[PDB]
Design a binder for this molecule. Structure first.
Ligand SMILES: C[S@@+](CC[C@H](N)C(=O)[O-])C[C@H]1O[C@@H](n2cnc3c(N)ncnc32)[C@H](O)[C@@H]1O
Ligand SMILES: C[S@@+](CC[C@H](N)C(=O)[O-])C[C@H]1O[C@@H](n2cnc3c(N)ncnc32)[C@H](O)[C@@H]1O
Ligand SMILES: [Mg+2]
Ligand SMILES: [Mg+2]
Lengths: 379, 374
């Protein structure tokens, strides 16, 4: 085994609360930490959990290309990996969603034979779905970088959700500590008018960064984005959400191939899943209590568990070790190095529990933890 | 005006580790918990954190429409809200990403006048970006439900990433405890052949659910998906990633209006067909690295300058839901009861404005919110 590793983790968007349990445990275990976050409470919190940190944010500067900064950020991390150290990089949100230097550093580490992994986090788009009360499933979601959207003439879909990141720095390749002069913003507004029309809604979204703050969820017309006092509200942490303009027709040939309806029958056009998208222009709210809904609610009074339902029935020893593998990176490493020896080290496991842990297979652990007489489709 | 609330939270995809600190703290503080997760170690963990939990998974059944189950799930949660209680619903991953009952329950609670909020979590798409080593920024990302993709003829874009959820149950409305007979999967494969070609890559992705497991990241051709032994590997936790065919050329009219020049970023997408190796250390990269020797902190860079007392209270507001509720009820009273704050710190907390808290915690030299790493 070659010494040295790079694990890159996120902190989420809202200070501290949106960090994952595994991001925290890897930060605490690291030999060195490199971080890039944009609120002071999160920075202070990281500095309590590890005493060998470097702030990557100081490698930005007024008038400096962001590409130069990114090469510097990545080289600082890989230099320490090359000394045989367990290094952790930290980026706000999800560390691989609209983040350049993380992909670069991990690809270099991997090419040179070091252990390299990214742990996912909660992005600004994850926050958007939660705060605007939409699901990417209905009716699909397109996500772009705003400048790229324009330069490569990326296609819109007026029947699906559209999300645009980096709307506060259209055509801007450098940095300033105070803020951007977003004077090419009109080029974006022109594209939106062309595709959606002057009166279609655009939602200006800023997720709350502090736990007591409310999110910004302000609706404007495409035309209203040319007013100055409205335009200056769009900054470095602004994202746009553009809702669908219309509903796309169903394909009858596909409906028959999928056997969803027989030949001769057409879908119910006036049918929608509750609730309606609140941001769409002139769309009425759907009824939550149709007769079929009301009948399902009646069945609750009766209801008991089905015969094939598998209730949880585990032990303290088993639950404890499974929790430990998720929260203690050193215990995980030991388990992976030798399943059998780790399994024999754990007190109080039953023969079936010890064997299931010895194997490590998903089927085995489920048999050991559930009363028997992988399907999670909630979509 | 009215007692009772609903907060919906997620657990992430990989057992326990991918839960957020705030999802955990709201689960602990709740009067009643309702959960729907799909591995036993996460279920066991939830049950150690609150004494009053109900498993929503028992409302599925063989040959029963998933729609009927979703209506029952939402009504059970809102019933406890109507009793004036603080209720938490828990769904695996992000609780609003391809999840029907969460949106339903939140919309009903809001319309009736109760407090209602969703806290975001780590989705299967978040895991996909991390494990396949791709960024939705480059070159854009389209995300669809596989059956909806077919039924409403949703457009493909051959120059952007494509992600498809629910590929294991094409055209299937009901539930079965054993698994799906995914016998309409061929209709999906036909659309992908029409749009991308028989030899184009499709990556079959399953994120690790247990902390010791490896992800499934198996690359097939579209044509290979017709083979019975390959098709039957696609199940209830399977997602597809389809990479771009090629790179789209820049538009000169727009380049002129943005005032740019009339150069691929490292690293290249490993999944895209016939993409060459990009050099990590070009001349410009080598010169950026040389500058690290003499580098010092910029003049307008604002180093953190805070106190133990101020850091502690900001951490407390993020990790203690009842402390947050107390502060939001009365900023003055809360700030007065925090020991050892400076006058500037106490006044900043009383205001609660972002500008005030940032001034209190940083040195401002001779005010920005600017995090563009994309
Ligand atoms: C360099 S990127 C980093 C994104 C981050 N890694 C994430 O996971 O969301 C910066 C862009 O993220 C989005 N963003 C960051 N903070 C946000 C917030 N609080 N609310 C809404 N969008 C935000 C904006 O579009 C911004 O221009
Ligand atoms: C009902 S949805 C729930 C999604 C969940 N809320 C999330 O945040 O990802 C079920 C679909 O999620 C995706 N999914 C769930 N678990 C997964 C895993 N471990 N790896 C890849 N995709 C997964 C699959 O597309 C699956 O058919
Ligand atoms: Mg990534
Ligand atoms: Mg949502």
């Amino acid at each position: 085994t070659k010494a040295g590793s790079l694990t890159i983790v996120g902190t989420g968007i809202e200070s501290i609360g949106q960090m994952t349990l595994q991001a925290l445990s890897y930060i605490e275990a690291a030999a060195k930490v490199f971080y890039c976050v944009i609120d002071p409470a999160t920075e202070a919190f990281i500095l309590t959990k590890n005493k060998n940190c470097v702030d990557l944010y100081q490698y930005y500067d007024n008038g400096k290309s962001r590409l130069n900064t990114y090469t510097q950020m990545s080289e600082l991390m890989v230099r320490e990996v090359r000394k045989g150290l367990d290094v952790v990089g930290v980026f706000y949100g999800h560390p691989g969603v609209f983040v350049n230097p993380s992909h670069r550093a991990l690809a270099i580490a991997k090419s040179e034979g070091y252990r390299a992994r990214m742990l996912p986090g909660v992005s600004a788009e994850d926050c958007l779905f939660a705060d605007l009360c939409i699901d990417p499933s209905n009716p699909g979601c397109l996500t772009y970088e705003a400048s790229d959207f324009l330069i490569r003439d990326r296609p819109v879909s007026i029947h699906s959700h559209l999300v645009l990141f980096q709307v506060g720095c259209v055509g801007i390749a450098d940095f300033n500590f105070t803020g951007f002069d977003n004077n090419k913003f009109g080029v974006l507004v022109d594209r939106l008018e062309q595709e959606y029309g002057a009166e279609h809604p655009v939602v200006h979204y800023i997720a709350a960064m502090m736990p007591h703050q409310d999110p910004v969820t302000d609706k404007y017309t495409v035309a209203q984005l040319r007013e100055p006092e409205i335009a200056k509200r769009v900054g470095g942490v602004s994202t746009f959400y553009i809702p669908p303009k219309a509903r796309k027709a169903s394909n009858l040939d596909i409906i028959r191939r999928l056997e969803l309806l027989p030949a001769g029958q057409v879908p119910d056009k006036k049918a929608r899943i509750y609730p309606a998208n609140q941001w769409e222009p002139d769309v009425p709210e759907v009824e939550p209590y149709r007769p079929s809904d009301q009948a399902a609610i009646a069945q609750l009074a009766d209801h008991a568990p089905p015969e094939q339902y598998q209730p949880l029935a585990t032990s303290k020893a088993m639950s404890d070790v499974m929790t430990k593998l998720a929260l203690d990176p050193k215990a995980l490493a030991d388990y992976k190095a030798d399943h059998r020896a780790f399994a024999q080290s754990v007190p109080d496991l039953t023969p079936q529990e010890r064997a299931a842990l010895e194997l490590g297979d998903s089927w085995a652990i489920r048999c050991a933890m559930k009363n028997m007489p992988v399907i999670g489709v909630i979509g």
